[PDB]
Design an enzyme around this catalytic site. Structure first.
Site, PDB file in Angstrom:
ATOM      1  N   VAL A 121      12.763   4.578  35.248  1.00 38.14           N
ATOM      2  CA  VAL A 121      11.934   4.533  34.365  1.00 38.14           C
ATOM      3  C   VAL A 121      13.487   4.271  33.060  1.00 38.14           C
ATOM      4  CG1 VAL A 121      10.170   4.682  32.823  1.00 38.14           C
ATOM      5  CG2 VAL A 121      10.091   6.094  34.728  1.00 38.14           C
ATOM      6  N   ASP A 169      -2.872  14.770  38.800  1.00 37.24           N
ATOM      7  CA  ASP A 169      -1.982  15.649  38.265  1.00 37.24           C
ATOM      8  C   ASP A 169      -1.528  15.415  37.565  1.00 37.24           C
ATOM      9  OD1 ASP A 169       1.293  14.554  39.807  1.00 37.24           O
ATOM     10  OD2 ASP A 169       0.587  16.673  39.784  1.00 37.24           O
ATOM     11  N   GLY A 185      14.431   8.976  39.781  1.00 36.94           N
ATOM     12  CA  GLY A 185      14.508   9.728  40.509  1.00 36.94           C
ATOM     13  C   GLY A 185      13.609   9.286  42.829  1.00 36.94           C
ATOM     14  N   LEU A 220      15.149   6.553  31.179  1.00 37.11           N
ATOM     15  CA  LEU A 220      14.391   7.883  30.539  1.00 37.11           C
ATOM     16  C   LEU A 220      14.022   8.387  31.702  1.00 37.11           C
ATOM     17  CD1 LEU A 220      11.860   5.534  28.091  1.00 37.11           C
ATOM     18  CD2 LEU A 220      13.828   6.560  27.791  1.00 37.11           C
ATOM     19  N   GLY A 221      13.867   8.626  32.859  1.00 39.58           N
ATOM     20  CA  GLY A 221      13.435   9.224  34.264  1.00 39.58           C
ATOM     21  C   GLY A 221      13.661   8.648  35.281  1.00 39.58           C
TER      22      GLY A 221
END
Ligand SMILES: NCCCc1cc2c(-c3cccc(O)c3)c[nH]c(=O)c2c2cc(-c3cn[nH]c3)ccc12
Length: 269
Positions: free
Chosen positions: A19, A119, A17, A14-15
């Site tokens: 997920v 954030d 760097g 999903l993500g």
């Protein structure tokens, strides 16, 4: 009870760097799994355990399994709000208003339990199957109110284009107006498809222009009168003068009828 019910297959990134989308072997239920190569995370877990709201990404649990931690959270199939914003355009005003209402509901909830997100930006605002907005990523979040006593913040935290000017200029600051400010930048992005400045400092030309009321300039000229008047109240340099959420809820644009319901039943004669 039933065998295999605890087994999840990781079917897609999903993500990262990372997920991953996890699918239950038996039920096919979907969840998002955050996998951390532990070598903040304890804070994200401790904060998530406190959360339970329709506009906040649900936390299901965690597994330590050595040094690799597993966080199980709500899968939001609509992805990031960030992907709904068309560059230099934004999105239809009715959609931006609905997402803004849902964002305020999530923030009101968090502030009500004494938590600040710190954030807020479109990458951290996820969408479910019905385009309901859910605030995510509590890795930078913190408790600003405990035993009914407010604690002033002093840590530099967040994402520059979204941070409030007091975080750059003052040693200490109230948590709540900072989250209100970043919501105003998210609203600007939704309505103009651009961020107004790299950061809110006088050295930044676009910021100075805004404080001089030069709204005939870029992202402002693309924004209608009503929502622009709300932005004029949110993006106020002095956080003590900045509009609070209860007052945002009284704003004219905030309460303007613009958007029809989902729409579903249709047959004539
Ligand atoms: N900032 C976004 C980061 C990446 C990220 C994190 C999450 C988390 C999640 C889990 C643990 C911690 C956390 O902060 C977020 C929970 N639930 C998600 O659905 C999800 C997610 C869904 C999509 C997607 C693309 N198409 N459809 C869905 C893409 C990126 C995602």
């Amino acid at each position: 009870a039933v065998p295999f019910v605890e087994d999840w297959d990781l079917v897609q990134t999903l993500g990262e760097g990372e997920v991953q989308l996890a699918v239950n072997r038996v039920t096919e239920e979907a969840v998002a799994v955050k996998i951390v190569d532990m070598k903040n995370i304890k804070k994200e877990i401790c904060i998530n355990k406190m959360l339970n709201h329709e506009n906040v990404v649900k936390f299901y649990g965690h597994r330590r399994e050595g040094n690799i931690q597993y966080l199980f959270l709500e899968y939001c199939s609509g992805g990031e709000l960030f992907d709904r914003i068309e560059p230099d355009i934004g999105m239809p005003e009715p959609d931006a208003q609905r997402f803004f209402h849902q964002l305020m509901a999530g923030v009101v909830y968090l502030h009500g339990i004494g938590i600040t997100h710190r954030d807020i930006k479109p990458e951290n605002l996820l969408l479910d199957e019905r385009d309901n907005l859910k605030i995510s990523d509590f890795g930078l979040a913190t408790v600003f109110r405990y035993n009914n006593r407010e604690r002033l913040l002093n840590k530099m935290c967040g994402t520059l284009p979204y941070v409030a000017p007091e975080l750059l200029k003052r040693r200490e600051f109230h948590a709540e107006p900072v989250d209100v400010w970043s919501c105003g930048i998210v609203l600007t992005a939704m309505l103009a498809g651009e961020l107004p400045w790299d950061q809110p400092s006088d050295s930044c030309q676009e910021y100075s222009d805004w404080k001089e009321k030069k709204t005939y300039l870029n992202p402002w000229k693309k924004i209608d009168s009503a929502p622009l008047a709300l932005l004029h109240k949110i993006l106020v340099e002095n956080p003590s003068a900045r509009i609070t959420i209860p007052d945002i809820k009284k704003d004219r644009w905030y309460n303007k009828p613009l958007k029809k319901g989902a729409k579903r039943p249709r047959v004539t004669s």
